[PDB]
Structure formats: structure tokens, C-alpha cells
CSV table of C-alpha atoms in Angstrom, one decimal:
chain,number,residue,atom,x,y,z
A,19,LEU,CA,-23.0,-84.8,64.1
A,20,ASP,CA,-24.8,-81.5,63.6
A,21,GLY,CA,-27.8,-81.9,61.3
A,22,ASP,CA,-28.5,-80.5,57.8
A,23,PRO,CA,-26.0,-80.7,55.2
A,24,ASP,CA,-23.3,-78.0,54.8
A,25,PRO,CA,-23.1,-75.8,51.6
A,26,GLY,CA,-19.4,-75.1,51.8
A,27,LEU,CA,-16.4,-76.0,53.9
A,28,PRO,CA,-16.0,-75.6,57.6
A,29,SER,CA,-12.4,-74.6,57.5
A,30,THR,CA,-10.8,-72.8,54.4
A,31,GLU,CA,-7.3,-73.2,55.6
A,32,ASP,CA,-7.7,-76.8,56.8
A,33,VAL,CA,-8.9,-77.5,53.2
A,34,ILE,CA,-5.8,-75.9,51.5
A,35,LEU,CA,-3.3,-77.7,53.7
A,36,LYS,CA,-5.5,-80.8,53.3
A,37,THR,CA,-5.2,-80.7,49.4
A,38,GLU,CA,-1.7,-79.4,49.2
A,39,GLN,CA,-0.5,-82.3,51.5
A,40,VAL,CA,-2.3,-84.7,49.1
A,41,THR,CA,-0.4,-83.7,46.0
A,42,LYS,CA,2.9,-84.2,47.9
A,43,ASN,CA,1.9,-87.6,49.2
A,44,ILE,CA,1.1,-88.6,45.5
A,45,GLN,CA,4.7,-87.5,44.4
A,46,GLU,CA,6.2,-90.0,46.8
A,47,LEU,CA,4.5,-92.7,44.9
A,48,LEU,CA,5.5,-91.4,41.5
A,49,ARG,CA,9.1,-90.7,42.3
A,50,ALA,CA,9.3,-94.2,44.0
A,51,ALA,CA,8.1,-95.7,40.7
A,52,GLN,CA,10.8,-94.0,38.5
A,53,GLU,CA,13.4,-95.0,41.0
A,54,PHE,CA,12.0,-98.7,41.2
A,55,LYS,CA,11.0,-98.8,44.7
A,56,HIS,CA,8.3,-101.5,44.9
A,57,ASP,CA,9.2,-101.7,48.7
A,58,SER,CA,8.4,-98.0,49.1
A,59,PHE,CA,5.1,-98.4,47.3
A,60,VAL,CA,3.6,-99.8,50.5
A,61,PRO,CA,4.3,-96.8,52.7
A,62,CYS,CA,3.9,-94.3,49.8
A,63,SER,CA,0.4,-95.5,49.1
A,64,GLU,CA,-0.4,-95.5,52.8
A,65,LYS,CA,0.6,-92.0,53.4
A,66,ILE,CA,-1.6,-90.9,50.5
A,67,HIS,CA,-4.6,-92.5,51.8
A,68,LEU,CA,-4.1,-90.5,55.1
A,69,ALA,CA,-4.5,-87.3,53.3
A,70,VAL,CA,-7.6,-88.6,51.5
A,71,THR,CA,-9.4,-89.9,54.7
A,72,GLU,CA,-8.0,-86.9,56.8
A,73,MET,CA,-9.4,-84.4,54.2
A,74,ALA,CA,-12.8,-86.2,53.9
A,75,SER,CA,-13.1,-86.5,57.6
A,76,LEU,CA,-13.1,-82.7,57.8
A,77,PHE,CA,-16.4,-82.9,55.7
A,78,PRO,CA,-20.0,-83.7,57.3
A,79,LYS,CA,-21.7,-87.1,57.0
A,80,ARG,CA,-23.9,-85.4,54.5
A,81,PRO,CA,-22.5,-82.8,52.0
A,82,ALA,CA,-24.6,-80.1,50.3
A,83,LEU,CA,-22.5,-79.8,47.2
A,84,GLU,CA,-23.2,-81.6,44.0
A,85,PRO,CA,-19.5,-82.0,43.1
A,86,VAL,CA,-18.6,-82.7,46.8
A,87,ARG,CA,-20.7,-85.8,46.8
A,88,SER,CA,-19.2,-87.4,43.7
A,89,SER,CA,-15.7,-86.1,44.7
A,90,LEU,CA,-15.9,-88.1,47.9
A,91,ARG,CA,-16.6,-91.3,45.9
A,92,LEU,CA,-13.6,-90.8,43.5
A,93,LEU,CA,-11.4,-89.5,46.2
A,94,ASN,CA,-12.0,-92.4,48.4
A,95,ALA,CA,-11.9,-94.8,45.7
A,96,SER,CA,-8.6,-93.3,44.5
A,97,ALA,CA,-6.8,-94.0,47.8
A,98,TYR,CA,-8.5,-97.5,48.0
A,99,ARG,CA,-7.3,-98.5,44.5
A,100,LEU,CA,-3.7,-97.3,45.2
A,101,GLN,CA,-3.7,-99.3,48.5
A,102,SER,CA,-4.9,-102.5,46.8
A,103,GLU,CA,-2.7,-102.1,43.9
A,104,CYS,CA,0.5,-101.2,45.8
A,105,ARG,CA,-0.4,-103.9,48.4
A,106,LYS,CA,0.6,-106.5,45.9
A,107,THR,CA,4.0,-105.2,45.0
A,108,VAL,CA,7.1,-107.2,43.7
A,109,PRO,CA,9.6,-106.8,46.6
A,110,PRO,CA,11.0,-110.3,46.1
A,111,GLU,CA,13.4,-111.3,43.3
A,112,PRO,CA,13.1,-109.5,40.0
A,113,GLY,CA,12.0,-112.7,38.3
A,114,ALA,CA,8.9,-112.9,40.4
A,115,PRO,CA,5.5,-113.7,38.8
A,116,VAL,CA,4.1,-110.4,39.5
A,117,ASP,CA,4.0,-108.0,36.6
A,118,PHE,CA,6.4,-105.2,37.9
A,119,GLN,CA,6.2,-103.5,34.6
A,120,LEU,CA,2.4,-103.3,35.0
A,121,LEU,CA,2.7,-102.3,38.6
A,122,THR,CA,4.2,-98.9,37.8
A,123,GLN,CA,1.5,-98.2,35.3
A,124,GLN,CA,-1.2,-99.1,37.8
A,125,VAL,CA,0.3,-96.7,40.4
A,126,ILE,CA,0.9,-94.0,37.9
A,127,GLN,CA,-2.7,-94.1,36.7
A,128,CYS,CA,-4.2,-94.2,40.2
A,129,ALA,CA,-1.6,-91.5,41.4
A,130,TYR,CA,-2.3,-89.3,38.5
A,131,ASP,CA,-6.2,-89.7,38.8
A,132,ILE,CA,-6.1,-89.0,42.6
A,133,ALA,CA,-3.8,-86.1,42.0
A,134,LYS,CA,-5.9,-84.5,39.2
A,135,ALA,CA,-9.1,-85.2,41.2
A,136,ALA,CA,-7.7,-83.0,43.9
A,137,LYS,CA,-7.4,-80.0,41.4
A,138,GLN,CA,-11.3,-80.0,41.0
A,139,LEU,CA,-11.7,-80.1,44.8
A,140,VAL,CA,-9.3,-77.3,45.4
A,141,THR,CA,-10.8,-75.1,42.7
A,142,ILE,CA,-14.3,-75.7,44.0
A,143,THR,CA,-13.5,-74.4,47.5
A,144,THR,CA,-11.6,-71.3,46.1
A,145,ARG,CA,-14.5,-70.5,43.6
A,146,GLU,CA,-17.0,-71.1,46.3
A,147,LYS,CA,-18.2,-68.2,48.6
A,148,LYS,CA,-20.5,-69.8,50.9
A,149,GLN,CA,-22.4,-66.6,51.7
């Protein structure tokens, strides 16, 4: 803990590496989709959540940024949706009941959303001065 909300970020570098790593984790989910790797979706989605939680963890329990407050909602929700979506994959036979075709669309939408959501977070830190 500390007290009042923070205007900017604690560590500039930590943020960059935290965001840069997020984009990479997402690529794993996308690449696995095009290569039809439902079994790789479980881990690919998990690794992505780590970057999301790890990044948010660096932030205080009470942010002082307008976009930071909302960004935490979409960011956290992004990793949550991907986990729940990937959680129900089609590792079994190809004739399974699950809609494998729809699965790829779900992971792509979530991955693309979380990936783009990071752009707004990385740009906010760079543009920010905290002086």
C-alpha cells in the first residue's frame, strides 16, 4: 500500500517490457489458431493472462488516470475472456460437438482486442510526463 492515487507509472521501463511482452504472448494465440492448435490454446491463453495480471500488479490499488481506470477493466476482462474461451477448446476428435470454427473467431477477436487495447496503454505512458 501507499496512500493517495498515483498520477503516472512507477517504473517506465517496467511498463514498456510489460506491454511489449503482452503483444508477444498474444501472437502465440493467433499463430496457434492459424496452425490449428486447440491444445496450444490453453497455454497460449494462460501466458497472455500473466502479462496482463503482471502489468496491472505494477499499478497501485487506486490509479489517478482516467484511461488507466478503464484500461484496467478492458485489460483484465480481455485476459479473462480469452481464458474462458480457450478453456473450452476442441482437443478431442475433429467431429466433436464444440464449434472449432467459432473457436478461432473467439480467440482472434479477444486476442485482437487485448492486443489493440495495449496500444492505448503504451501510448498513454509515452505521452505522459508525470511532472
